[PDB]
């Protein structure tokens, strides 16, 4: 309660053959569907054609999405990667969630 869970790491490290890009952010999670799983379809979204027709479910869960290059690289880091390297690929990922507060 009176002690932080983690620190703010948000910088890249270049070790010649590899680069480690860390990126911390602050998030907010509301309560979705008022805690209910609701069945959704193209008819609930206001109907559609047959090409846009669907059937799925909404859930009360949120999800983290860091699947974009700008969440990891800064415009400068990206330029330092683009001008000097011929290829690149990801090797390992390390996700961490901390400093949680549940406001009411």
């Amino acid at each position: 309660v009176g002690n932080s869970s983690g620190n703010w790491h948000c910088d890249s490290t270049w070790m010649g053959d590899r680069v480690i890009t860390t990126s911390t952010r602050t998030w907010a999670l509301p309560t979705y569907n008022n805690h209910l799983y609701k069945q959704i379809s193209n008819s609930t979204s206001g109907g559609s054609s047959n090409d846009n027709a669907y059937f799925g479910y909404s859930t009360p869960w949120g999800y983290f999405d860091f699947n974009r290059f700008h969440c990891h690289f800064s415009p400068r880091d990206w330029q330092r990667l683009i001008n000097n390297n011929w290829g690149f690929r990801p090797k390992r990922l390390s996700f961490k969630l901390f400093n949680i507060q549940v406001k009411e």
């Binding site: 910088d11 800064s74 415009p75 400068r76 990206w78 330029q79 001008n83």
Partner: protein, 103 residues
Amino acid sequence: LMGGFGLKHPPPQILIKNTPVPADPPTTFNQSKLNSFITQYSTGQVSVEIEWELQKENSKRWNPEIQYTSNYYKSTSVDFAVNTEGVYSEPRPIGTRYLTRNL
């Protein structure tokens, strides 16, 4: 003042000449120095290897910097390349001050 590194003991001067080779001297002694020589010149290769120490850039800037780049537009001839006659030419003077740093 012209740029560069001021050195108290700079790379020494490598001096080189062709050793004289006299043409056929008289058959009777003449105290005068020989002024007739065999015309010659020398050729060959020369290598010069220099090791430079670098100081890598650790900029923590956010937006992109100013890099030196060959302009992407199409030209008649590539820059820093030989023309259609085999004559190499450097189109512009390139300096070093591209990357920025705080004061």
